[PDB]
Amino acid sequence: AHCG
Amino acid sequence: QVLVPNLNPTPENLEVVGDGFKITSSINLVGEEEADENAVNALREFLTANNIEINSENDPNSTTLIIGEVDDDIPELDEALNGTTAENLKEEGYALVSNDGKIAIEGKDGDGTFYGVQTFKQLVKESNIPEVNITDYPTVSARGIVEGFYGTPWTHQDRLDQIKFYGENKLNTYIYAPKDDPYHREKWREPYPESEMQRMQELINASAENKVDFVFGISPGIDIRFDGDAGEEDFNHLITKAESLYDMGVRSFAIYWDNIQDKSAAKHAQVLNRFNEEFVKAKGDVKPLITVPTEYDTGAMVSNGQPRAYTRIFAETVDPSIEVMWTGPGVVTNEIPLSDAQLISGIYDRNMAVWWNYPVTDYFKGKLALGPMHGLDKGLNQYVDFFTVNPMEHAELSKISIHTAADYSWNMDNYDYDKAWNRAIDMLYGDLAEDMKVFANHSTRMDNKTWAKSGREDAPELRAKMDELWNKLSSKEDASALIEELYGEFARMEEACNNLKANLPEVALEECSRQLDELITLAQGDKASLDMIVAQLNEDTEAYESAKEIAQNKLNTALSSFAVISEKVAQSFIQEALSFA
Ligand SMILES: *[C@@H]1O[C@H](CO)[C@@H](O)[C@H](O)[C@H]1NC(C)=O
Numbered sequence: 113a114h115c116g
Numbered sequence: 117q118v119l120v121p122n123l124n125p126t127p128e129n130l131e132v133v134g135d136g137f138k139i140t141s142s143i144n145l146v147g148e149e150e151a152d153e154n155a156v157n158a159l160r161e162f163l164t165a166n167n168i169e170i171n172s173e174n175d176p177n178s179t180t181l182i183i184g185e186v187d188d189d190i191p192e193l194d195e196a197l198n199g200t201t202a203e204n205l206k207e208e209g210y211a212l213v214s215n216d217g218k219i220a221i222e223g224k225d226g227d228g229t230f231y232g233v234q235t236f237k238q239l240v241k242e243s244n245i246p247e248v249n250i251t252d253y254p255t256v257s258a259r260g261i262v263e264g265f266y267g268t269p270w271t272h273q274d275r276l277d278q279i280k281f282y283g284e285n286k287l288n289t290y291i292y293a294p295k296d297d298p299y300h301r302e303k304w305r306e307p308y309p310e311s312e313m314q315r316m317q318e319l320i321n322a323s324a325e326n327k328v329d330f331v332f333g334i335s336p337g338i339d340i341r342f343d344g345d346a347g348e349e350d351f352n353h354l355i356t357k358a359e360s361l362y363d364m365g366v367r368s369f370a371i372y373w374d375n376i377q378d379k380s381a382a383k384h385a386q387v388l389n390r391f392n393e394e395f396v397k398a399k400g401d402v403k404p405l406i407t408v409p410t411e412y413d414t415g416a417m418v419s420n421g422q423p424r425a426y427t428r429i430f431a432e433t434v435d436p437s438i439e440v441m442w443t444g445p446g447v448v449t450n451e452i453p454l455s456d457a458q459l460i461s462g463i464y465d466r467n468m469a470v471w472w473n474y475p476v477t478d479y480f481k482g483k484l485a486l487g488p489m490h491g492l493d494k495g496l497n498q499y500v501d502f503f504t505v506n507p508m509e510h511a512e513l514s515k516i517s518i519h520t521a522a523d524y525s526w527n528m529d530n531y532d533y534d535k536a537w538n539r540a541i542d543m544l545y546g547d548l549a550e551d552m553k554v555f556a557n558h559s560t561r562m563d564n565k566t567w568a569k570s571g572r573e574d575a576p577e578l579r580a581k582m583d584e585l586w587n588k589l590s591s592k593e594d595a596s597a598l599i600e601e602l603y604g605e606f607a608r609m610e611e612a613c614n615n616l617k618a619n620l621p622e623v624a625l626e627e628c629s630r631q632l633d634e635l636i637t638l639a640q641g642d643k644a645s646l647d648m649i650v651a652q653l654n655e656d657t658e659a660y661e662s663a664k665e666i667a668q669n670k671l672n673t674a675l676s677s678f679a680v681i682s683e684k685v686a687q688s689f690i691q692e693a694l695s696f697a
Contacts, residue, residue: 114266114479115375115447116567 118244122543124519124536125286125526127235127252134215134247139240140178142169146192147184152226154325155183158233158283166243182220185229196220200249202228208288209253212236214245224253230327231286258439258502259525260289260328261518262471264372266478267509269294272315274511276322281515283326285522289504290323291370291406293333295478301335305353307360320365331368331406332361337376342383351390358395362402369396370406379410381426385433392435406439406502408471414445414456423463431464439502441469448473448568451491457499469502474571475517476506480564482680484513484628487560487572488520488537494529510627516540516556533572548619554612555628558635558682574685578605582689589649589697599646606646609639609686634679638686641670645693652697667693 118136143163148156159181163170171178184190186203194201202211202222209224210232221236223229235252239245260282263270270278279290294300299308308316323330334357341350358369371391373384388407396402409430411417417427434440442460444452452470461468472492475485485508496503503525507514519540524531538553545552560572573579581602588595613632617625644666651660671690681687 115473116479 118246120246120248121239121241122539123235123238124539124543125523126530127250128527128530129249129251131249132246133249136244136246137179137214137217139168139243139245141167141243142171142175142178144174144178144180145170146180146182147188147190150185150188150190151183152185152223152229154327155221155223155226155229155233157325158230158237159183162233162237162240166240168243180218182218183229183233184221185223185226187225193220193222197222198249200251202251205251205253207257208286209251210235212248212250212252214239215247215249219245227288227327228253230283234284234286237284254286254526255497255528256501256503256525258289258329258469258504259522260287260291260504262291262293262333262504262506264291264293264295264333264471264506265476265509266295267481269297270509270511272318275319278511279319279322279326279328281518282328285519286526287518287522288327289329289331289368289502291331291333291504292319293335293370293372295335295375300333301338304334304336304338304340304357305350307357313360313364316361317364324365329368329403330366331370332358332366333370333372333406334358335372335374335376337373337378337384337410340378340387342380342387351387354387354391355395358391362399367401368403368406372408373410374408374412376410379426381409381429382433384410385430388438389433389435392438404437404439406441406469407434408441412441412471413443413447413449414460415447417442417463418459421459427463434464436466439469440464440466441471441502441504443471443473446567448476448479448562448570449491450570452493452496454493454495454498457493457496461499467501468499470496470500470504472503472505472521473568474505474562475508475514477508477510477562479568480562480680481509482678483562484508484510484559484631484681485562485571486513486516486556488517488533488540489524489531490533490560490572491570492524494531497528512623513627515544519544537572548616551612551615554608555616555632555635558609558686559631561684563683574682579685581605582685582692585649586692586697595649599650602646603643606639606642609642610636613639630677630679631681634674634677634681635686637670637673637677638682638690641667641674641690642686644670645690648693664694 182193182196184193196218197213197220200211200213202224205224208227210228211222212232213220221232320330341347392405396405411426445456477485505521520536523536541553542549557575561574562571563569585598613636617632644663647663
């Protein structure tokens, strides 16, 4: 859904 | 006396040498048959749009425009530059002289001549041009955008508009890598359907037209096989895919390893080297291969000043000619200080490329990122030669941040983030600039309160007055002057956002309309919050109880809104006011  | 208008990027060397003059309604064009085809076309569109005919024969009573490259033998150009030359400048540089009814552009190369025309286009308002001597050239050789965010990929019209925008701001790079394009990553082996290839051809053509290096990205780290027949076959899928885009005119390639489970450093680097030798070098006219390793922020790359396992092996193996990108100290981080680029450039024994995750908002989609390049060291060019920003899924409002990235990458040591931010909004928003600054001022700081934090703080001057007021109250000082100052600020917040809602074009409005409604709500809530302070000072409880419900009402709306804005300023003020004194 995104990085990190 | 004609003044130098807003320029972007800020040219390296500019002096005014005259009063300025008005360009005649018909001009002598000189050197267009030898000059860079794309430069000349850009110049023709501009002239057509501003109703300037081109003479078919020389007319001594009409302005004369001479254009050409250093490496064209055109003496009328050397004569008109009047001792100024582009000969000695770095690639993409140019010289521009406007004096005594003549404008001369000499590019170090064609890219240079095109950029010279862009500056020419920016200097003319209503046919008037200042008389100036310019020599100009970039700090960083590669400057642009990586479309590499998560969420709704840009449309075809979004990207064509973006590409025209890059050329106008001397950005020379666009990396196609949308995470949610199934053919980029999820299904990287599959060829693009015929109709998508027609859209591709259009983007490539527009890129060439605007001197943008269209980089075709591929992300096969999801499921790529490395060994035996399977690794052969998977490797040949990269070749086939790059070939079919080469055959349409693509001359830059990227192979990305970011956000994948497989951490086979050696195999990743060997694929790169093999592609670099059997494709990039073999073709001979293809630009250096770009990559991102699976470890791509300092935090994930380095432990106690020493490279991690993946990074060490990857750096050891990857060919020196390949550009390697990293995002800086974290994935989304406040700063890239010089010392961070020094460390990482050291591990790779090469100049690095930056993948800057701002203004991307895929990690916190409720907020717009509308601030300037901020926290990037102005000496980064000692260790960085390739600079790219990851924009938002909102292409139009990404323009504000990109505008400032154009200034920082072209003339980095002169870069003033506040001045650059102001100029971006002034140039992009026109009659509405003042009001847009008021709104955008509250939407520069990205903070998901976990691991993503970056950008200039939200409206710092207002936060300072608010902070100051709580001191004047807890310190029993006369605050009445500060409260009138603050009432004024909140009224203008409301005024500006109502004006934008009424007057912004669809293309901007369709991207931020929900955040305007949010800031109006908060402004109204800050106003009631002051009414609460006023009523508390007057020991007037009726007015206090009434203001308090309105304050809670506006706050309740913001916390349940999808829209996020001014979290730590306009929003916090209402939360502060609801905490006694
Ligand atoms: C990692 O982080 C960001 C933010 O969610 C995302 O935009 C980007 O695609 C990811 N990849 C890289 C190389 O930053």
